[PDB]
Structure formats: C-alpha cells, structure tokens
PDB file of C-alpha atoms in Angstrom:
ATOM      1  CA  UNK A 262       0.000   0.000   0.000  1.00 33.76           C
ATOM      2  CA  UNK A 263       1.291   3.449  -0.940  1.00 36.19           C
ATOM      3  CA  UNK A 264      -1.614   5.426   0.494  1.00 36.41           C
ATOM      4  CA  UNK A 265      -0.627   8.003   3.100  1.00 39.53           C
ATOM      5  CA  UNK A 266      -3.297   9.520   5.344  1.00 38.23           C
ATOM      6  CA  UNK A 267      -6.095  12.073   5.577  1.00 40.05           C
ATOM      7  CA  UNK A 268      -6.296  15.488   7.223  1.00 38.63           C
ATOM      8  CA  UNK A 269      -5.276  15.204  10.873  1.00 36.47           C
ATOM      9  CA  UNK A 270      -6.334  18.819  11.441  1.00 40.05           C
ATOM     10  CA  UNK A 271      -9.772  17.531  12.428  1.00 40.09           C
ATOM     11  CA  UNK A 272     -10.803  16.244  15.859  1.00 40.86           C
ATOM     12  CA  UNK A 273     -11.711  12.600  15.270  1.00 38.92           C
ATOM     13  CA  UNK A 274     -12.560   9.696  17.550  1.00 37.32           C
ATOM     14  CA  UNK A 275     -11.159   6.283  16.686  1.00 35.50           C
ATOM     15  CA  UNK A 276     -13.522   3.572  17.891  1.00 38.12           C
ATOM     16  CA  UNK A 277     -13.997  -0.170  17.254  1.00 41.17           C
ATOM     17  CA  UNK A 278     -10.825  -2.012  16.249  1.00 40.89           C
ATOM     18  CA  UNK A 279     -12.980  -4.704  14.663  1.00 39.12           C
ATOM     19  CA  UNK A 280     -12.296  -8.386  14.158  1.00 39.46           C
ATOM     20  CA  UNK A 281      -8.979  -9.245  12.551  1.00 44.17           C
ATOM     21  CA  UNK A 282      -9.549 -10.328   8.967  1.00 44.26           C
ATOM     22  CA  UNK A 283      -7.862 -13.700   8.617  1.00 44.60           C
ATOM     23  CA  UNK A 284      -7.793 -13.137   4.853  1.00 44.46           C
ATOM     24  CA  UNK A 285      -5.673 -10.005   4.448  1.00 45.71           C
ATOM     25  CA  UNK A 286      -4.227 -10.411   7.965  1.00 49.53           C
ATOM     26  CA  UNK A 287      -5.134  -6.805   8.735  1.00 50.07           C
ATOM     27  CA  UNK A 288      -7.559  -4.985  11.019  1.00 50.81           C
ATOM     28  CA  UNK A 289      -9.646  -1.890  10.347  1.00 49.85           C
ATOM     29  CA  UNK A 290     -10.614   0.809  12.837  1.00 50.35           C
ATOM     30  CA  UNK A 291     -13.242   3.512  12.328  1.00 54.11           C
ATOM     31  CA  UNK A 292     -12.798   7.184  13.163  1.00 51.47           C
ATOM     32  CA  UNK A 293     -15.838   9.377  13.713  1.00 50.94           C
ATOM     33  CA  UNK A 294     -15.918  13.176  13.452  1.00 49.42           C
ATOM     34  CA  UNK A 295     -17.202  14.896  16.586  1.00 48.18           C
ATOM     35  CA  UNK A 296     -16.433  18.542  15.773  1.00 49.07           C
ATOM     36  CA  UNK A 297     -15.185  20.479  12.748  1.00 50.47           C
ATOM     37  CA  UNK A 298     -14.157  24.088  12.059  1.00 48.99           C
ATOM     38  CA  UNK A 299     -14.923  26.911   9.618  1.00 49.63           C
ATOM     39  CA  UNK A 300     -11.606  26.725   7.755  1.00 49.45           C
ATOM     40  CA  UNK A 301     -11.879  22.923   7.874  1.00 46.92           C
ATOM     41  CA  UNK A 302     -14.783  21.119   6.212  1.00 48.26           C
ATOM     42  CA  UNK A 303     -13.876  17.525   7.243  1.00 51.61           C
ATOM     43  CA  UNK A 304     -15.687  14.220   6.637  1.00 55.30           C
ATOM     44  CA  UNK A 305     -18.020  12.614   9.188  1.00 54.10           C
ATOM     45  CA  UNK A 306     -16.238   9.250   9.257  1.00 56.53           C
ATOM     46  CA  UNK A 307     -12.874   7.778   8.284  1.00 56.06           C
ATOM     47  CA  UNK A 308     -11.477   4.273   8.003  1.00 57.18           C
ATOM     48  CA  UNK A 309      -7.946   3.043   8.694  1.00 58.95           C
ATOM     49  CA  UNK A 310      -6.532  -0.463   8.344  1.00 57.95           C
ATOM     50  CA  UNK A 311      -3.336  -1.744   9.947  1.00 60.33           C
ATOM     51  CA  UNK A 312      -1.463  -5.100  10.070  1.00 61.64           C
ATOM     52  CA  UNK A 313      -2.844  -7.613  12.580  1.00 58.76           C
ATOM     53  CA  UNK A 314       0.683  -7.861  13.966  1.00 61.94           C
ATOM     54  CA  UNK A 315       0.131  -4.375  15.396  1.00 61.83           C
ATOM     55  CA  UNK A 316       3.055  -2.614  13.744  1.00 65.99           C
ATOM     56  CA  UNK A 317       3.501   1.121  14.188  1.00 60.69           C
ATOM     57  CA  UNK A 318       6.044   3.164  12.251  1.00 60.02           C
TER      58      UNK A 318
ATOM     59  CA  UNK B 197     -39.250  46.814  -8.561  1.00 61.98           C
ATOM     60  CA  UNK B 198     -36.547  44.712  -6.958  1.00 63.90           C
ATOM     61  CA  UNK B 199     -35.273  41.181  -7.527  1.00 63.04           C
ATOM     62  CA  UNK B 200     -33.915  39.621  -4.324  1.00 60.64           C
ATOM     63  CA  UNK B 201     -32.046  36.315  -4.318  1.00 62.34           C
ATOM     64  CA  UNK B 202     -30.837  34.370  -1.283  1.00 56.80           C
ATOM     65  CA  UNK B 203     -27.577  32.453  -1.182  1.00 55.20           C
ATOM     66  CA  UNK B 204     -27.058  30.303   1.911  1.00 55.39           C
ATOM     67  CA  UNK B 205     -23.922  28.323   2.778  1.00 57.70           C
ATOM     68  CA  UNK B 206     -24.747  24.820   3.787  1.00 59.42           C
ATOM     69  CA  UNK B 207     -21.284  23.331   3.991  1.00 55.73           C
ATOM     70  CA  UNK B 208     -20.035  20.893   6.605  1.00 54.22           C
ATOM     71  CA  UNK B 209     -18.765  23.762   8.699  1.00 54.75           C
ATOM     72  CA  UNK B 210     -22.372  24.861   9.006  1.00 54.14           C
ATOM     73  CA  UNK B 211     -23.758  23.750  12.343  1.00 57.50           C
ATOM     74  CA  UNK B 212     -27.389  22.487  11.972  1.00 60.29           C
ATOM     75  CA  UNK B 213     -28.364  25.072  14.604  1.00 58.23           C
ATOM     76  CA  UNK B 214     -27.184  28.031  12.532  1.00 61.59           C
ATOM     77  CA  UNK B 215     -28.404  26.478   9.280  1.00 62.23           C
ATOM     78  CA  UNK B 216     -31.814  26.453  10.920  1.00 60.24           C
ATOM     79  CA  UNK B 217     -31.370  30.110  11.856  1.00 61.43           C
ATOM     80  CA  UNK B 218     -30.612  30.884   8.208  1.00 61.85           C
ATOM     81  CA  UNK B 219     -33.889  29.323   7.134  1.00 60.20           C
ATOM     82  CA  UNK B 220     -35.790  31.115   9.891  1.00 61.97           C
ATOM     83  CA  UNK B 221     -34.125  34.389   8.924  1.00 63.48           C
ATOM     84  CA  UNK B 222     -35.008  33.957   5.243  1.00 64.29           C
ATOM     85  CA  UNK B 223     -38.625  33.106   6.077  1.00 66.90           C
ATOM     86  CA  UNK B 224     -38.903  36.129   8.368  1.00 69.61           C
ATOM     87  CA  UNK B 225     -37.459  38.305   5.597  1.00 66.21           C
ATOM     88  CA  UNK B 226     -40.010  36.973   3.109  1.00 67.95           C
ATOM     89  CA  UNK B 227     -42.768  37.477   5.679  1.00 64.36           C
ATOM     90  CA  UNK B 228     -41.581  40.976   6.608  1.00 67.80           C
ATOM     91  CA  UNK B 229     -40.745  42.269   3.134  1.00 69.15           C
ATOM     92  CA  UNK B 230     -43.878  40.747   1.653  1.00 70.59           C
ATOM     93  CA  UNK B 231     -44.707  43.312  -1.031  1.00 66.52           C
ATOM     94  CA  UNK B 232     -47.215  42.982  -3.873  1.00 68.14           C
ATOM     95  CA  UNK B 233     -44.367  43.682  -6.299  1.00 65.73           C
ATOM     96  CA  UNK B 234     -41.583  41.619  -4.776  1.00 66.61           C
ATOM     97  CA  UNK B 235     -40.501  38.098  -5.670  1.00 68.04           C
ATOM     98  CA  UNK B 236     -37.911  35.898  -3.985  1.00 67.55           C
ATOM     99  CA  UNK B 237     -35.435  33.198  -4.949  1.00 64.36           C
ATOM    100  CA  UNK B 238     -33.215  30.915  -2.881  1.00 65.64           C
ATOM    101  CA  UNK B 239     -30.249  28.753  -3.769  1.00 71.87           C
ATOM    102  CA  UNK B 240     -28.217  26.744  -1.281  1.00 76.35           C
ATOM    103  CA  UNK B 241     -24.608  25.845  -1.951  1.00 75.88           C
ATOM    104  CA  UNK B 242     -21.641  23.782  -0.844  1.00 75.23           C
ATOM    105  CA  UNK B 243     -19.564  22.109  -3.522  1.00 79.02           C
ATOM    106  CA  UNK B 244     -22.768  21.789  -5.498  1.00 78.20           C
ATOM    107  CA  UNK B 245     -25.681  24.203  -6.005  1.00 76.35           C
ATOM    108  CA  UNK B 246     -29.354  23.558  -5.348  1.00 75.69           C
ATOM    109  CA  UNK B 247     -32.108  25.969  -6.307  1.00 75.31           C
ATOM    110  CA  UNK B 248     -35.148  25.448  -4.088  1.00 74.40           C
ATOM    111  CA  UNK B 249     -37.462  27.950  -5.740  1.00 71.48           C
ATOM    112  CA  UNK B 250     -37.113  30.486  -8.508  1.00 69.44           C
ATOM    113  CA  UNK B 251     -38.836  33.859  -8.928  1.00 69.90           C
ATOM    114  CA  UNK B 252     -41.451  32.047 -10.998  1.00 69.15           C
ATOM    115  CA  UNK B 253     -42.200  29.360  -8.410  1.00 67.31           C
ATOM    116  CA  UNK B 254     -42.509  31.964  -5.662  1.00 66.30           C
ATOM    117  CA  UNK B 255     -44.962  33.754  -7.947  1.00 68.61           C
ATOM    118  CA  UNK B 256     -47.020  30.557  -8.057  1.00 68.19           C
ATOM    119  CA  UNK B 257     -46.747  29.700  -4.367  1.00 65.40           C
ATOM    120  CA  UNK B 258     -46.066  32.810  -2.225  1.00 65.61           C
ATOM    121  CA  UNK B 259     -45.725  30.754   0.955  1.00 63.95           C
ATOM    122  CA  UNK B 260     -42.246  31.346   2.487  1.00 62.12           C
ATOM    123  CA  UNK B 261     -42.796  28.877   5.324  1.00 63.47           C
ATOM    124  CA  UNK B 262     -43.746  26.151   2.839  1.00 66.88           C
ATOM    125  CA  UNK B 263     -40.715  26.749   0.601  1.00 67.01           C
ATOM    126  CA  UNK B 264     -38.154  26.959   3.390  1.00 67.81           C
ATOM    127  CA  UNK B 265     -39.496  24.027   5.428  1.00 65.26           C
ATOM    128  CA  UNK B 266     -38.371  21.183   3.020  1.00 66.76           C
ATOM    129  CA  UNK B 267     -34.959  22.833   2.567  1.00 65.07           C
ATOM    130  CA  UNK B 268     -32.332  20.335   3.727  1.00 61.25           C
ATOM    131  CA  UNK B 269     -28.608  20.918   4.378  1.00 60.66           C
ATOM    132  CA  UNK B 270     -26.304  19.882   1.530  1.00 59.34           C
ATOM    133  CA  UNK B 271     -23.052  19.633   3.558  1.00 60.25           C
ATOM    134  CA  UNK B 272     -19.571  19.470   2.055  1.00 62.05           C
ATOM    135  CA  UNK B 273     -17.143  22.248   1.113  1.00 62.75           C
ATOM    136  CA  UNK B 274     -17.655  25.936   0.259  1.00 64.71           C
ATOM    137  CA  UNK B 275     -18.002  27.527  -3.175  1.00 67.71           C
ATOM    138  CA  UNK B 276     -18.946  31.138  -2.444  1.00 71.30           C
ATOM    139  CA  UNK B 277     -17.138  32.521  -5.483  1.00 71.83           C
ATOM    140  CA  UNK B 278     -18.432  29.865  -7.854  1.00 73.76           C
ATOM    141  CA  UNK B 279     -21.844  30.416  -6.281  1.00 70.12           C
ATOM    142  CA  UNK B 280     -21.918  34.187  -6.759  1.00 68.71           C
ATOM    143  CA  UNK B 281     -21.028  33.726 -10.427  1.00 68.52           C
ATOM    144  CA  UNK B 282     -23.861  31.226 -10.823  1.00 64.93           C
ATOM    145  CA  UNK B 283     -26.354  33.442  -9.002  1.00 68.16           C
ATOM    146  CA  UNK B 284     -25.754  36.383 -11.347  1.00 72.69           C
ATOM    147  CA  UNK B 285     -26.061  34.096 -14.392  1.00 75.78           C
ATOM    148  CA  UNK B 286     -28.820  31.607 -13.497  1.00 73.73           C
ATOM    149  CA  UNK B 287     -30.773  33.060 -10.561  1.00 76.48           C
ATOM    150  CA  UNK B 288     -30.982  36.510 -12.136  1.00 73.18           C
ATOM    151  CA  UNK B 289     -31.927  35.093 -15.535  1.00 73.93           C
ATOM    152  CA  UNK B 290     -35.112  36.238 -17.298  1.00 76.00           C
ATOM    153  CA  UNK B 291     -35.949  32.601 -18.063  1.00 77.03           C
ATOM    154  CA  UNK B 292     -36.036  31.729 -14.360  1.00 80.29           C
ATOM    155  CA  UNK B 293     -38.149  34.748 -13.501  1.00 82.60           C
ATOM    156  CA  UNK B 294     -35.818  37.741 -13.244  1.00 84.59           C
ATOM    157  CA  UNK B 295     -37.336  41.001 -14.420  1.00 86.93           C
ATOM    158  CA  UNK B 296     -35.751  43.735 -16.525  1.00 82.77           C
ATOM    159  CA  UNK B 297     -35.037  47.255 -15.146  1.00 80.96           C
ATOM    160  CA  UNK B 298     -35.666  45.856 -11.653  1.00 83.11           C
ATOM    161  CA  UNK B 299     -32.861  46.209  -9.108  1.00 81.55           C
ATOM    162  CA  UNK B 300     -30.664  43.197  -8.353  1.00 82.67           C
ATOM    163  CA  UNK B 301     -30.074  42.366  -4.694  1.00 82.07           C
ATOM    164  CA  UNK B 302     -28.059  39.379  -3.515  1.00 79.65           C
ATOM    165  CA  UNK B 303     -27.991  38.336   0.136  1.00 83.17           C
ATOM    166  CA  UNK B 304     -25.031  36.078   0.886  1.00 83.36           C
ATOM    167  CA  UNK B 305     -25.019  34.107   4.122  1.00 81.66           C
ATOM    168  CA  UNK B 306     -21.769  32.131   4.253  1.00 79.54           C
ATOM    169  CA  UNK B 307     -19.767  30.485   7.029  1.00 81.93           C
ATOM    170  CA  UNK B 308     -16.974  32.995   6.437  1.00 78.10           C
ATOM    171  CA  UNK B 309     -14.434  30.635   4.972  1.00 76.94           C
ATOM    172  CA  UNK B 310     -14.486  29.961   1.235  1.00 76.40           C
ATOM    173  CA  UNK B 311     -12.354  26.798   1.419  1.00 78.37           C
ATOM    174  CA  UNK B 312     -12.177  24.447  -1.555  1.00 77.78           C
ATOM    175  CA  UNK B 313     -13.393  27.003  -4.094  1.00 80.25           C
ATOM    176  CA  UNK B 314     -11.233  27.021  -7.266  1.00 79.13           C
ATOM    177  CA  UNK B 315     -12.487  30.495  -8.134  1.00 77.49           C
ATOM    178  CA  UNK B 316     -11.586  33.670  -6.313  1.00 73.63           C
ATOM    179  CA  UNK B 317     -13.674  36.710  -5.464  1.00 75.49           C
ATOM    180  CA  UNK B 318     -11.716  38.723  -8.005  1.00 74.74           C
ATOM    181  CA  UNK B 319     -13.144  36.379 -10.638  1.00 73.53           C
ATOM    182  CA  UNK B 320     -16.766  37.017  -9.663  1.00 74.14           C
ATOM    183  CA  UNK B 321     -16.995  40.429  -7.968  1.00 73.55           C
ATOM    184  CA  UNK B 322     -16.149  42.401 -11.205  1.00 72.54           C
ATOM    185  CA  UNK B 323     -18.947  40.401 -12.839  1.00 72.95           C
ATOM    186  CA  UNK B 324     -21.604  40.992 -10.185  1.00 71.17           C
ATOM    187  CA  UNK B 325     -20.758  44.704 -10.144  1.00 72.25           C
ATOM    188  CA  UNK B 326     -21.236  44.996 -13.903  1.00 68.80           C
ATOM    189  CA  UNK B 327     -24.650  43.307 -13.977  1.00 69.27           C
ATOM    190  CA  UNK B 328     -25.626  45.762 -11.239  1.00 68.91           C
ATOM    191  CA  UNK B 329     -26.033  43.263  -8.427  1.00 67.18           C
ATOM    192  CA  UNK B 330     -26.104  44.820  -4.944  1.00 71.60           C
ATOM    193  CA  UNK B 331     -24.485  42.560  -2.343  1.00 70.94           C
ATOM    194  CA  UNK B 332     -25.450  42.144   1.304  1.00 72.15           C
ATOM    195  CA  UNK B 333     -23.452  39.854   3.565  1.00 70.32           C
ATOM    196  CA  UNK B 334     -24.744  38.218   6.722  1.00 68.92           C
ATOM    197  CA  UNK B 335     -22.047  36.668   8.890  1.00 71.20           C
ATOM    198  CA  UNK B 336     -22.657  33.561  10.980  1.00 71.34           C
ATOM    199  CA  UNK B 337     -20.637  31.534  13.483  1.00 73.93           C
ATOM    200  CA  UNK B 338     -17.103  32.858  13.976  1.00 76.19           C
ATOM    201  CA  UNK B 339     -17.144  34.912  10.747  1.00 77.96           C
ATOM    202  CA  UNK B 340     -16.645  38.079  12.822  1.00 78.68           C
ATOM    203  CA  UNK B 341     -14.038  36.613  15.157  1.00 80.55           C
ATOM    204  CA  UNK B 342     -11.451  35.714  12.523  1.00 77.48           C
ATOM    205  CA  UNK B 343      -9.614  38.258  10.372  1.00 75.01           C
ATOM    206  CA  UNK B 344      -9.674  36.093   7.254  1.00 74.11           C
ATOM    207  CA  UNK B 345     -13.425  35.658   7.537  1.00 74.33           C
ATOM    208  CA  UNK B 346     -14.058  39.348   8.302  1.00 70.39           C
ATOM    209  CA  UNK B 347     -12.180  40.602   5.244  1.00 72.43           C
ATOM    210  CA  UNK B 348     -13.854  37.958   3.085  1.00 71.19           C
ATOM    211  CA  UNK B 349     -17.245  39.375   4.037  1.00 69.82           C
ATOM    212  CA  UNK B 350     -16.017  42.879   3.205  1.00 69.48           C
ATOM    213  CA  UNK B 351     -14.921  41.609  -0.210  1.00 69.60           C
ATOM    214  CA  UNK B 352     -18.390  40.325  -1.068  1.00 69.99           C
ATOM    215  CA  UNK B 353     -20.376  43.260   0.297  1.00 69.50           C
ATOM    216  CA  UNK B 354     -20.725  46.311  -1.930  1.00 66.46           C
ATOM    217  CA  UNK B 355     -18.741  49.362  -0.850  1.00 62.52           C
ATOM    218  CA  UNK B 356     -18.909  50.676   1.686  1.00 60.36           C
ATOM    219  CA  UNK B 357     -18.650  47.138   3.179  1.00 63.87           C
ATOM    220  CA  UNK B 358     -19.335  48.427   6.704  1.00 63.97           C
ATOM    221  CA  UNK B 359     -22.834  49.471   5.673  1.00 63.18           C
ATOM    222  CA  UNK B 360     -23.400  46.158   3.882  1.00 63.63           C
ATOM    223  CA  UNK B 361     -22.140  43.591   6.398  1.00 65.44           C
ATOM    224  CA  UNK B 362     -24.476  42.523   9.179  1.00 67.06           C
ATOM    225  CA  UNK B 363     -24.561  39.826  11.832  1.00 69.56           C
ATOM    226  CA  UNK B 364     -27.003  36.903  11.625  1.00 68.31           C
ATOM    227  CA  UNK B 365     -27.791  37.488  15.293  1.00 66.00           C
ATOM    228  CA  UNK B 366     -28.540  41.147  14.605  1.00 63.94           C
ATOM    229  CA  UNK B 367     -32.311  41.397  14.441  1.00 63.44           C
ATOM    230  CA  UNK B 368     -32.170  45.171  13.930  1.00 62.82           C
ATOM    231  CA  UNK B 369     -30.199  44.537  10.732  1.00 61.48           C
ATOM    232  CA  UNK B 370     -33.418  43.718   8.870  1.00 63.59           C
ATOM    233  CA  UNK B 371     -34.863  47.150   9.623  1.00 65.21           C
ATOM    234  CA  UNK B 372     -31.516  48.649   8.636  1.00 64.93           C
ATOM    235  CA  UNK B 373     -31.342  46.893   5.256  1.00 65.02           C
ATOM    236  CA  UNK B 374     -35.002  47.694   4.592  1.00 67.50           C
ATOM    237  CA  UNK B 375     -34.072  51.307   5.324  1.00 69.68           C
ATOM    238  CA  UNK B 376     -31.177  51.454   2.837  1.00 71.86           C
ATOM    239  CA  UNK B 377     -33.442  49.665   0.339  1.00 72.98           C
ATOM    240  CA  UNK B 378     -35.308  52.958   0.079  1.00 74.44           C
ATOM    241  CA  UNK B 379     -32.259  54.873  -1.121  1.00 74.92           C
ATOM    242  CA  UNK B 380     -31.512  52.189  -3.727  1.00 75.65           C
TER     243      UNK B 380
END
C-alpha cells in the first residue's frame, strides 16, 4: 500500500478495532468526526486499516 | 421593482443550529418584506448548487414557510465565489423569472471561509458589479471573530462594506437593510 493519510487537522474519535480479517491479515478501525471548524470542512467518518501484527512506524 | 435572491452556505462547517437560523431568517425576511411587487429566490450551496425555488415558483406559491421548510442541508465544502457567479447568471436570468429594469439584490449568508473554491472573489466580484447586483453579507458563526473571515465578508459586500455587512444574530439589521433599500 502506498496510500498516506487524511487530514489530521480535524478532531476525530477512533472507535472499534474490529475483528482481525484472517484473509488479508489486517484490522480496520473507524474514526468518527465529533467537531469540525470553519476553515476545515472535514468528513463525518474515516477508516484506517493496519497489520494484525500491530506494527507502528 | 426589486429582484432579491438568497444564497445560503450549507457546507459541513455549518452547524445544523445556525443552518436552521438561516432558514428562519429567510422566512422572516419573506414574511416581513412581503410586497405585492416583490418576488424571492433561494439557492443553497456547498460544492454543489441547489435551487429550491425560482422567482417564478414563488410567484405561483407565495408561501415562504412552505418553501423553506423542506430545505435540507447539503453539507460538504464551500463555493462562495463559484456560487456568486452562478447566481448572477442563473438566478438573475429572465428565463427563471428575473425582471428587466428591476434592481438586483443578492444576500449572501456564508460560514466565512471559502475553502475548496477554485475560483476567487476577483473572478466574480467584477462580474456581479457589472450586472448591477447589490451585495449584502450576513455573517454567521465565527465569521466576525477571525480576520480572514471578516475581510472575506467585506470583499463580497458592496462598498462601503461596513454598511453592507451585518450579523445573523442582529435582528435590527433587517430594519436597517429595509431602510437602505429605500435609497436604492
């Protein structure tokens, strides 16, 4: 995967790590928007998937 | 004698509470300035543009409360510049219901931040000024707390901007605008 990330300038809430997909060997977490700004029209929900091995770089 | 069009920002930065206030404000304006020779038009915008009722439709159903009630929030980004250009070309078009010789008045109620708009104000203001479109800006949220938002409002409002920029929470503003509308 060569996809980076979204705008972190928005106050999100990452909830539900979800079940680990035994197919791709990854896990997806959902981030929900709780408050935005005037000079920042952000999305209501975001999705992020990471390796089931829990690697952070 | 006058053609008034409403442009309301319904982006994601628009809190449902204030969006509601916009609708209430518009309805009150249409209920207060209800003249036998006065039509109204309203178009909401974000990244897209949705006309809810033209001058013709309002001429068929002169019920402000019934035209503003079904108005839902679009959400998304802001296209104030692109919107202004569209308003002076589509909203104020004879085919939609715009009249000739009648004065053009555009009330812009934006969040204050035109983010995501590929067009600038310099690309639409010289156009709106040529077609003879008077601009009135109503600031909401933090539009008067930030410098960038304040100046933006002063760039949309016809000069002098001070006498053409009012607060959405300013109830006396309606009587003020209605006053200047006499010295058109």
